[PDB]
DNA sequence: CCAGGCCCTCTAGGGCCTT
């Protein structure tokens, strides 16, 4: 009554218009879907240095939020309401959902989705805004959320750490990442994290991963 | 107008972490 292991790992990661408290909406979604083999055994260029896996599938969509963006969100995201508008994107709606799950039946399953603070952040959005349009992922899908799992991983050899995206990239790369906020920047940073650990996370997430099941909406979405 | 599960510090209080 088990499905197999986890064969490709989707990672996530949402802009949108504000923090839970103001129940936003995503203004732009990237998704980096990875075959399990290239986090196995991470490739790595002459220099010793992680480079993105070669076989790599990647969808980023932007699109308008029906409600506008506090000034925070949008000083530090680069979006508006108006910029969306005008270069001619929709809402969340039917072509994202058909986007995605297209996207998501082009990876060998089952897929498990990975988000930094996904478990209080991009998992309940995302399934607030699929909920919305009565939309699903595969049944057999799971969730990582690399904030619970690094933080019991370091916790597991132990004997106050900051565990945001920013501070575990200077941590392990001893360097500043690029395109904070842009939702590729952020993938390929939380990318990069995870590769940096990856048998450690894989483990993490073979023994702990959430069924997408079980994610409820961060919010219930008004109607139209 | 203003989240919440988590974690760690004087077990209730406070900050983290996501935009
Ligand atoms: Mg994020
Ligand atoms: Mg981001
Ligand atoms: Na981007």
Not at 83 to 105: D, P, W
Not at 117 to 124: A, E, K, L, M, S
Request: aromatic content about 8%.
């Amino acid at each position: 009554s088990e499905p197999p292991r986890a064969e490709t790992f989707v990672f996530l990661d949402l802009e949108a218009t504000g923090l839970p408290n103001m129940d936003p909406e995503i203004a732009e979604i990237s998704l980096f879907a990875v075959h399990r083999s290239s986090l196995e055994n991470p490739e790595r260029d002459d220099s010793g240095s992680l480079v993105l896996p070669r076989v790599l599938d990647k969808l980023t969509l932007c699109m308008c939020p029906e409600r506008p963006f506090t000034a925070k969100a949008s000083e530090i995201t680069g979006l508006s309401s108006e910029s969306l508008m005008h270069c001619g994107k929709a809402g969340f709606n039917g072509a994202v959902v058909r986007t995605l799950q297209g996207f998501l039946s082009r990876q060998e399953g089952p897929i498990c989705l990975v988000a930094h603070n996904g478990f209080d952040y991009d998992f309940p959005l995302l399934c607030t805004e699929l909920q919305r349009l009565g939309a699903h992922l595969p049944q057999d899908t799971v969730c990582l959320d690399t904030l619970p799992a690094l933080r019991g991983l370091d916790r597991a050899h132990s004997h106050r750490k900051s565990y945001s995206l920013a501070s575990l990239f200077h941590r392990y790369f001893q360097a500043e990442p690029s395109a904070a906020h842009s939702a590729e920047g952020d993938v390929h940073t939380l990318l990069l994290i995870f590769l940096h650990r990856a048998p450690e996370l894989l483990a993490w997430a073979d023994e702990q991963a959430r069924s997408w099941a079980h994610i409820e909406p961060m919010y219930v979405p008004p109607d139209g």
